[PDB]
Amino acid sequence: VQISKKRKFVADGIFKAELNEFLTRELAEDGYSGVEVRVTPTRTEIIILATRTQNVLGEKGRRIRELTAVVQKRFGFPEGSVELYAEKVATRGLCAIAQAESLRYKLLGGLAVRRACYGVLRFIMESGAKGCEVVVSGKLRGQRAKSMKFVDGLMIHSGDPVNYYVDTAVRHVLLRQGVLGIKVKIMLPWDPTGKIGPKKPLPDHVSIVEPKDEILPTTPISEQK
């Protein structure tokens, strides 16, 4: 029967955690970025956000169909009551999870640590972020473990504006020697969806917007029509 409200909130939270972990473990070869979930009466729609769509839908829409089953058979939904779709996130370098997965993939292919980190930092700079720092920790050369990080741009480490202004992702990459940890942290620009431009006022940080100054005519006499 029905349960209490706080328990329903906790249950949907644990379901979201289940789903995110499952799609990170399963969709670890496509490049996994995130998930959105929307609810209407007895219709729950889940969207997997990833950089490659033609690769995640699969042949004739196989995987996208199959996922439904492994949702339906697990989450306990009534038959045919779960729908799920696939759209591509507009940008890639501004999602810390996506770039952490990219770095993990590059280290999975044997590409060296420093050049892979340089590539991802250059991508993030070209992505439009005003700062990124990535750390690869563990064994890179030798028996002992080095924590090697590159930081460029700006990055806040304190205060509230580190949740809605910094994206952080932690991932692990296995190796014949052990496990390497990848921490990717990204700054975000001011206005939503990657600084489209000023919109309805939702101020979140200090800025000096300087408009064009008024200009007077040089000619002693005024305009004539």
Partner: peptide, 27 residues
């Protein structure tokens, strides 16, 4: 520029392999 020997040296600038890495970096 070769980065592999640079990283190997930067991990330990005075290790067992420091002389060889520094010599390889010279030229």
């Amino acid at each position: 520029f070769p980065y592999e020997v640079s990283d190997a040296l930067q991990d330990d600038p005075k290790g067992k392999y420091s002389k060889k890495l520094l010599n390889k970096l010279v030229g």
